[PDB]
Structure 1
Amino acid sequence: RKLCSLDNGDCDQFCHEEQNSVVCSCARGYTLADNGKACIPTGPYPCGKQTL
């Protein structure tokens, strides 16, 4: 297990392998955090989250 095969490449959501490195991205309604791994909701009621 390497890159995206190793614990989802440490990404919160989508993991892609580009030029032999990990590239993380997020679903619509989320923005990639400054660490390039976590996904932060851009507004209220982000997709895929149970409410309250």
Structure 2
Amino acid sequence: KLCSLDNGDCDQFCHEEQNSVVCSCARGYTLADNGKACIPTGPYPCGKQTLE
């Protein structure tokens, strides 16, 4: 099911390349070492409600 199965465990963008799941992130985020989570590169990342 890849991407069709819970977004392929990706935090954000999910692509099916060569019958394999490939995750990516929006501008301002860095794909984490596990290749799934998205890490904000700096303060006030897009899509995040301001808490502090």
For the residues of structure 1 that align with 2:26 and 2:18, how far apart are their CA atoms? 22
Q: What is residue 39 of structure 2 aligned with on the other side?
A: 40
For these two proteins, the number of residue pairs brought into alignment is: 51
1:12-31 aligned within 5 A:
12-31=11-30
Shift of 1:43: 0.2
TM-score w.r.t. structure 2 length?
0.97
Shift of 1:15: 0.1
Displaced runs of 4+ in structure 1, greater than 2 A? none
Task: Structure 2: state its 5+ residue gaps.
Answer: none
Task: Structure 1: state its 5+ residue gaps.
Answer: none
TM-score w.r.t. structure 1 length?
0.97
Shift of 1:35: 0.1
CA deviation map 1:1-52 (0-9, x unaligned): x000000000000000000000000000000000000000000000000001
